[PDB]
Design a binder for these strands. Structure first.
Lengths: 120, 117, 119
DNA sequence: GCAGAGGCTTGGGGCTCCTAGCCTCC
DNA sequence: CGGAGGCTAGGAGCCCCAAGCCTCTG
């Protein structure tokens, strides 16, 4: 098994790939195992989220969410890795949240997930 | 409910408030469940020794790290794991005596990665 | 003005002259100014003091006391350099306490104030 | 028997990064 | 737009020293 490295390509365009940025976005998405995803579904409630949801992805499980306060992409990644028990994890800020959600409800992607429907 | 460690072992602990010192060995005091969890979720510091212990209505996990950490950095670390579980963490100065006192009559030993020292 | 440094020689045998010693004594003696002493007479009460007495030297007064808990001669020396931020004072541990007080009552000196008689 | 010397042991704190927000430019 | 990147209050790691403790010895 690859793991792999980054988000699947079919939605890898909807993401922000900035290593040299300090911008504090409000929208984030993550990619781990459905198990590690299930647990992170609760930890996120430290940044007081307005919305959150976990979807079903091929050979993984993506969970996106949005907070009220702005935060760093790096700040979120560093926060989740605290639970990383030899498990894989990748974090990137979503520039277009509405496009992402609907894309995770297509064919290769399902739901289970969320909390609220429309966004801000 | 219990804030600050019991008195019988408050002499082996460090009660610094305005210190920026970095020590390697600590001791945390939380519920029995958070104790078990923070036993493995602490291996992210590449510890040398960790030992499960128990107390009156709570459990204490003392441990040591090859790297030097601040006592306030350890309380901020466990804080991210717990949410309901009470968190009172103080570094230990007399780790040998501490270890022993937690194996005496009123206490006991549960699990230990490596013997002692 | 003939500014003085260090206790007068006529009593420099009742004092501790240790400079490289980490020892912790009990009885201390300060040699500052008249009102500088009267000041420290209270500012020292922050040390849970048992006995304390103010005497009169020559160029000023001499504060004498005993702390319930031991301390460094340097610990007090530094603590006295906190309030005055001026003037001149000498802080040294008192090796011969009973003998000390005696001379400070002898004619060359005189007692000015003591919260309790020493025993 | 002192009295001075270091042997130790802690907390305080002056620094020097790291972190993770803030921001505005192109 | 969305990166890049400056700016800074706390977080957290360096180090030392102040001020206690102690036993030793000349």
């Amino acid at each position: 098994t690859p793991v792999p490295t980054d988000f699947p390509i079919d939605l890898s365009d909807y993401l922000s790939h900035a290593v040299y940025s300090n911008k504090t976005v409000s929208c984030f998405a993550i990619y781990t195992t459905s198990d590690k995803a299930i647990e992170l579904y609760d930890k996120i409630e430290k940044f007081k989220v307005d919305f959150k949801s976990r979807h079903a992805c091929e050979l993984g499980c993506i969970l996106l969410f949005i907070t009220l306060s702005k935060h760093r992409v790096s700040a979120i990644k560093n926060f989740c890795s605290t639970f990383c028990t030899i498990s894989f994890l990748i974090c990137k800020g979503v520039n277009k949240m509405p496009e992402m959600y609907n894309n995770l409800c297509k064919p290769p992607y399902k739901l289970l997930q969320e909390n609220k429907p429309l966004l801000n």
